[PDB]
């Protein structure tokens, strides 16, 4: 045990998505480890390594889907672990936990801004861009054109059950951003007008699927439809190594009182149930490209950023089991 | 001229929504020229007459996209029209209005519950079925399918703005029919599971087009994407007889209060524009079959439908223009 | 009450496939029919009006997917049961019942006819055709074109489990039409060079889909992937009137033994189930034509034909029925 | 023998295309047998018929694939055949030709104001429009749609080989119409920007195909991917009879000269053939409406206007055979 | 020269598949070569070398559509090779066959127990999976996953003209797997109800199709349209490299007399040809993963299999050449 | 400064399309490199260096959307940078300038008989084979097929507006294959017959996406709807590396007086606009493989060809900026 309250309290807000959004929520989880890291009164190697696998434990306990978050756990803790099973010392242990996490804190800063300096080149002046959900990745494309100084306008999908769009209407808008608010029904009535959609990821997985906000794979069908581009902004640590070894990505269910108040719910007959998946499934056909911070790709050489970035951690446990 | 008081109600309350749904709409505007000519102090037949088809242009202007509306209004006004021109007397006049006002009520009434009969044997014993909105009509076919004892399950999108689907759970729940209850945006995550698609319809087009709730279009998309079959339960008076000589359906934009309630919309900035379509347009290749009272077509016989029964109407003006 | 053998004999013909083709079948029954009468021992019209309408049941429920089997019969039957109410004689009942039969054989033979001469101006010299299962109404468009001196060569599908494609291969190369035979298997592969497709139809819906042996639906997708036309040549009494008013056709699940010979299938454990359905449904967008003897039709005018030849009957009881 | 002059210049001027389009080509061939009856110095009403029969085989042997022609000779011969059968004297029989011509040309004309006005309510303000070829049908829809105060452009298609785009960019530009001119093979880089398509037809078949100007398929096949309204402006004698009996459309296959200059292919290798089609054939799935002067249809619509309109000469000889 | 008898042993059960199946042709091959190497009365290498030539062309010559046949033999000879031209004496050359051969056999029993546990982390309780034609591979990822718990049920395929699917059903019931047994036509009617399809491969080319079993293209094809998985499951030497220099993959044909037995086919009409692919070659847009022994992989990724495990050989010739 | 006639020559003819072809534009490039450096009156490196930089930006400015020309000026002026930059001599610089561009030329000419080799692998005896515009890298292809005895027709479009068919006709033919020349509208229509397209490249981008003459996309979208293989025939310097980094490749526009000669146009309107884009977008679903030196892949496979051998490139800017 020994734990500081930092990470149960990072660990809390990432299941009540009082912190969310995968870059965000990869970060706090970095950021979790850290403070662990910084604040541990351990007085042995032993000791530290301990709650850091434990730290871990926790904060990978509380959202299954987006696999930013235990990318950013393993990043911290593969080289923690090294460390350790190498002799490292107390000092040199928390250390290599502190900067591993700093690290990869600032690379996820960097891999946004990247995305949207690359994506912004896909944007022509003129443009309507569809989004959905509220994704740091996207934003970054759709600032970076505006900042270039072409018109651009954002249709802004209202995203629910948890309203994210309002979240999107308003940083958009705060950049001087023209936007329409939509109903999520209303997308296929204006993806005739639409010239690009630009969309985040949670995960994307080894045959080119993206795992994003429930409503996404919608919107990509009708833009496919309509050969409406379809532009999956997301950094690498986005990519989903277990799928390489056929892995199933879980689909978070939520909980019945974020679609109906529980107020509401409880009046209402017990054989009404409500499903609130919190993501969907897009199949590669109706992506164009994933832009990441390293380039374009095409959906199918999704298995290649895995294959170059993650292939080599499958033959082991993950870092923080026993 | 002397318009009576429930006329004026009658539209306010279809233009505020207490009074919705196509066919309900429709119902209720023969009612309110019903009452206008039960009620009328017209002395003479001219002045009867006038106070129909002022009460008709009142109504007629409340809403646009449903033909429900004018179909009912044209049903009443036909029939006054060619009485008032025949020399009908006061009393004869004021009974055309009220008698073809009542036969428009009843042939609604019998239309649904034979559309049930005639859906509901398209519907097989352990089906999962999709629906979207509230429809009287796509319900009764849900409801008779229950009552022949097959195991159904409902899936029921929310439909917003307005949460429509809440009335559709409820109801449905209510008749002792399981529901599931999903947003909008998880209607294709949940295609794989459904067996059949049943919507409604506010209007259908010469070519076969289905004009219906915000959101239909994506539905029947996925569906056929799927192999889902999309039916869509819909009385006669649901054609659109202008689409035969190329007329355009208007589709409604409401309020942006009801997205955005106002004390929220109020502190949104100006560059943040709500837009709020409250139909779409579903092309016929998404659709299998139009369930009518008088049989099952495919959408490709809408425009037999519009010839054999409103088609001779076309040459003429409006039955309440001057 | 007193069925003469002939009834029992076409019945259980028909019940094993010894009698097969949806044309031949109805035929077939009608010929039944037309025995009872002649053959009939009663004295009064009440007698043979019974007996009557008992062998129609009888042969009705002999194999449900083919509509054409119930259409003969309706054809009879309507006449004998219009004759029988408007008090015909015992006389004058037989030979309504003797004279509709003949008069649905002939007409039957005719429409095959017919069927052959404008389907096969659809067919060009040098032309490739695919078939599926062994249609006299397809056959007829085929031995028709070879007459008119058109090259052309047909591609024979074995159709699994019953083996009809060696009934048509031996047929068409009778006529002198040189023949490929293939298993259903090898259709895509061949379809490439294909040039049109012909199959016939045990029943066709509203709608304008057609259920026919199965294997057919596999057929008219990898055509329509291909852009092959798909011709389906059926007689007006395949059209299926029920379907109007929303039933669904039953598809025939036969013996399991005419997949697996008794002799191998009990020697297989209990855990391996044989299913062996006689059909399936084509949908009509991978339908270009149905050639009817009245013509050519789009798949979707279906309804028409039933609206028609047929809609008149449904608001009746099946003649046969008391 | 003794046709007028007049007779063999229309049928010379058709043959070059020095008259074209298909209402044009019908027109003329009209007013061809208006002018054979009008200078005929027969005595005898045997006579004239004899001469409007061959008049009229000399026009039908002009250019194939354009129902039009046939149709209109038709129109004119059925009444003339009508006459003389009846025994309608001299004068009697050549006013029946004179007038049958007239009508004939005068509901042609209204048939082209009527298809305009009908399909300029689908057209709406601000619409980019592109077209193929040169149709007086469509064209009357666009110049409707300017005239009504929509700001419109027009997309026009050079249409080789024989330029007939220069004829629409030259008479659209004329009416204040703004155009853009295109080659053929720029049609799918532009349908993005195009709201709808608006072409005409030589001849539309029973089961829906729209056949017209080589290229037509293309654009309505590009339009479909993108989901752009795809709509043909057509007259209804522009529909094809004999296809309700299985004929198929002969495809004109002019002169190699009209792609390659006498003076240029003279010097090219034997071992290059040209092939010239004027005309390809489009499918009803590529085709959202058809606008006829009597209204909109879908594509599938076709057989019922055939049926209704033409059906009843099918069972006779082309009203100018012996 | 000197050839033992069980090279010809194995050549003629490969001919005549008495041995069958991609892996275990593969396996027999590398066995044989094993077995010519053990029992060669060979006392130079050269007269070795020349035997395993030799043998290796006897093997290669027997069918040519399974790549892993040839992937097999070249393993072995490479390595053969290489050890003859770097002057390996008599025993070191034979050992070198035989451990060479050994190891491809090891290696390929280790590869498809693999795949299975790859293959079934896909496969979900309740899944119906369709499989076709009788491929180690894909049973090895059906037996896995019910070995894991799973409540599958499989849809075995007939597998017309050599009934593959017995042996398929036969050895799943053996292992307590419920199955249901389908003639191949009957693939598109249940496809409804299938959750996954999971299929073998004998050869997968550089732009990622699959060739298989004749049908195997019909299923992959209609599952598409059904939006269900289509998973192959294959083993790396099921990748063919001649494929990335342009290499078309021969489709064998085999001997009529395995669709028509002879005893029936010589009473047939000489104008009957029996045509008999034993593959189907299906596009990658079918497919949605390959499994191999490392890892899942879109279609588009097998270039990639193929550069890096076979590219440095294709410079050469084969390796059993002069 | 002191630049050579043959670079301004060089670029103007580029600029005419007196020099045309991706190819040929990138090798003249070369040339004219290798032209200015032999003869140079430079004294000093310095002196040369800054000759080469003006003359590769005279010709990197002639024409943009064939990245074939940027590339082949990298190739040369990288390898003079890098001389430059690491102290070489006058005459070392001359030469490093002057081998680079007679090895790119050389290896241009290696590639495309390489391509044709490999291309011609995928074309069987008795195709037709579709292609579009002039492409050496398609011609070799064909060229091959042909000398390999295989009897192969070409369809030969005509390429508007500037009738590159015509060259590619008249060379297909001189070599001793049959060609069909049609308008490009007729592509449609033809695509019954085809089985083959073989087109060329100016850009290939990172998604896998092909920029090639006006036109390429119709007919590999039409080719696509009738499962006729698209190969595009692409040395790997088609490959366009800025496009890895999200840059758009512009779509060249060229003079309107290339469409309607100059004596025609100033006839014409003011509001007509003729809009001449020299290249479309075909999108990589409607391309099957990508024939290049090194081998056949999946268009998908872009990305990696440009991973390997361009994108090392990418963090400096070009060899010849100041
Ligand atoms: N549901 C799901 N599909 C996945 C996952 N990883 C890859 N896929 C692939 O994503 C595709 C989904 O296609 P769909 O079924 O949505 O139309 C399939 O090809 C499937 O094999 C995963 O974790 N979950
Ligand atoms: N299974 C079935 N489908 C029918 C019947 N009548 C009409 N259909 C129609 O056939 C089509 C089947 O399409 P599929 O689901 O096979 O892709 C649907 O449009 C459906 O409405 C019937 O009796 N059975
Ligand atoms: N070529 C041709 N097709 C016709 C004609 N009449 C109807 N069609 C129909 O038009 C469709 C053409 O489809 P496509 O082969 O172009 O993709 C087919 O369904 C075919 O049966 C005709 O005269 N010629
Ligand atoms: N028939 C055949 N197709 C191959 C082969 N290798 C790759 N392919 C590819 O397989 C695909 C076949 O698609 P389909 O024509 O069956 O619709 C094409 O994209 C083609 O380029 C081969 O050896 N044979
Ligand atoms: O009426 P005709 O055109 O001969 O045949 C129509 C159809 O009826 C047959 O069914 P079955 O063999 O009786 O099960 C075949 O499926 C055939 O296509
Ligand atoms: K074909
Ligand atoms: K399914």
């Known amino acids: 045990?020994?734990?500081?309250?930092?990470?149960?309290?990072?660990?809390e807000k990432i299941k009540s998505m009082e912190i969310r959004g995968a870059g965000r929520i990869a970060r706090a989880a970095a950021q979790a480890l850290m403070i662990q890291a910084e604040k541990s009164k351990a007085k042995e190697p032993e000791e530290l390594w301990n709650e850091?696998?434990?730290?871990?434990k926790i904060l990978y306990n509380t959202r299954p889907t987006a696999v930013s978050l235990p990318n950013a756990l393993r990043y911290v803790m593969h080289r923690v672990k090294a460390a350790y099973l190498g002799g490292a010392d107390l000092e040199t242990l928390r250390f290599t936990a502190i900067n591993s996490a700093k690290e990869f804190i600032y690379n996820?800063?960097?891999?946004?801004?990247?995305?949207?300096?690359i994506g912004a080149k896909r944007i022509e002046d003129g443009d309507i861009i569809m989004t959905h959900s509220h994704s740091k990745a996207a934003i970054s494309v759709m600032k970076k054109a505006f900042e270039q100084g072409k018109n651009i306008k954002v249709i802004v999908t209202e995203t629910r059950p948890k309203w994210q769009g309002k979240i999107t209407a308003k940083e958009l808008a705060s950049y001087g951003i023209p936007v329409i608010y939509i109903v999520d029904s209303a997308?296929?009535?204006?993806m005739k007008m639409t010239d690009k959609?630009?969309?985040?990821?949670?995960s994307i997985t080894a045959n080119g699927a993206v795992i994003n906000k429930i409503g996404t794979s919608l919107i990509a069908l009708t833009a496919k439809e309509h050969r409406v581009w379809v532009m999956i902004?997301?950094?690498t640590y986005k990519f989903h190594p277990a799928t390489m070894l056929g892995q199933l990505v879980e689909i978070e269910m939520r909980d019945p009182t974020e679609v109906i108040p529980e107020e509401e719910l409880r009046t209402w007959?017990?054989?009404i149930e409500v499903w609130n998946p919190a993501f969907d499934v897009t199949p590669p056909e109706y992506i164009d490209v994933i832009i990441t911070e390293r380039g374009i790709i095409p959906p199918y050489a999704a298995i290649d950023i895995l294959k170059e970035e993650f292939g080599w951690a499958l033959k082991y446990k993950e870092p923080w089991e026993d």
Chains 1, 2, 3, 4, 5, 6 share one sequence.
């Open 1 to 11: 045990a020994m734990i500081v309250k930092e990470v149960y309290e990072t660990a």
């Open 52 to 56: 850091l696998k434990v730290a871990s």
């Open 108 to 117: 996820s800063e960097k891999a946004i801004e990247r995305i949207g300096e």
């Open 187 to 190: 997308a296929r009535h204006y």
């Open 197 to 202: 959609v630009v969309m985040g990821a949670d």
């Open 233 to 235: 902004a997301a950094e």
């Open 269 to 271: 007959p017990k054989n």
